[PDB]
């Protein structure tokens, strides 16, 4: 119903100004844009726009009734607004929205399989053992029916037989199969799990509901549960507390060696 690109090519969910400008400058072209929900004033939105001379402007968008208001103008949807300033009128004098910048969506391009049965390896061979439900990255498949894989739960690498696995859909999060990752539970259930089953210094990671591409590290202190934001960069890394990491696993190792909260280290993920 609009001339805008699909929403997932420019909508970043809840995002602060600093990260939004980082993503626009990573994009690099004048006319690049994104829309975010204000982190500081939730329920209101921001059109962030890379102008000439590396300047990023930010335009507030107010959600009034079932519509969106910018500069006093009314739009039925964010898509209509983007279509308007891409193809109908200019946003700044002589400048229009040109290049949507997509949020860093996690993608797994490698083939994955899932164990339908447990398996105990033959000792002193290249086989690896696994539990029912283990997920694997397939690196290659041999014509014996065997595959060279990495088990995501254990990180062991070796041979398994295709008769004991099924295919995994491309849609599943790349962290599926990690022992600390829960890709299906709700925020409420993560809190409940850490309170009932988890112990002090237990933790888990799940995707953010409000920011596409983000993850949340849930951590249990003696008194409460704290949530920390992990944010991807456009450069295949992850950011937490302004520190940069090659993987979420690296974040977990870091906070096993350094205190995440004064007087606390990560101990064990809550069992799954």
């Amino acid at each position: 119903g609009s001339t805008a690109p699909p929403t997932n090519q420019w909508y970043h969910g809840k995002l602060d100004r600093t990260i939004a400008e980082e993503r626009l400058r990573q994009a690099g072209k004048s006319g690049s844009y994104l829309i975010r929900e204000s982190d500081r004033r939730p329920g209101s939105f921001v059109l962030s726009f890379l102008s000439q001379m590396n300047v990023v402007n930010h335009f507030r968008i107010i959600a009034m009734s079932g519509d969106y208001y910018i500069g006093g103008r009314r739009f039925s949807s964010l898509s209509d607004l983007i279509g308007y300033y891409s193809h109908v009128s200019s946003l700044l004098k002589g400048e229009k929205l040109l290049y949507p910048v997509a949020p860093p969506e996690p993608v797994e391009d490698r083939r994955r399989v899932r164990a339908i049965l447990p398996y105990t390896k033959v000792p002193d061979t290249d086989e690896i053992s696994f539990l029912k439900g283990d997920m694997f990255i397939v690196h290659n498949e041999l014509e014996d029916g065997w595959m060279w894989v990495t088990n995501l739960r254990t990180d062991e690498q070796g041979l398994i037989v295709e008769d004991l696995v099924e295919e995994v859909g491309r849609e599943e999060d790349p962290h599926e199969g990690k022992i600390w990752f829960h890709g299906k539970i709700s925020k409420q259930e993560a809190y409940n799990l850490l309170m009932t089953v988890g112990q002090v210094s237990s933790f888990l990671v799940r995707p953010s509901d409000n920011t596409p591409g983000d993850y949340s590290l849930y951590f249990r202190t003696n008194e409460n549960i704290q949530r920390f934001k992990i944010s991807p960069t456009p450069n295949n890394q992850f950011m937490m507390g302004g520190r940069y990491y090659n993987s979420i696993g690296d974040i977990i190792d870091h906070y096993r060696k350094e205190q995440i909260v004064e007087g606390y280290y990560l101990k064990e993920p809550v069992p799954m």
Binding site: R17, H58, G71, Y85, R227, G241, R243, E258, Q259, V261
Partner: peptide, 25 residues
């Protein structure tokens, strides 16, 4: 209800009242 910052967080904050928002042409 808010996200927390870790003990070694290195985020240097900026005040919202200083952030300038603009209006379309």
């Amino acid at each position: 209800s808010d996200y927390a910052e870790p003990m070694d967080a290195v985020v240097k904050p900026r005040n919202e009242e200083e952030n300038i928002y603009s209006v379309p042409h």
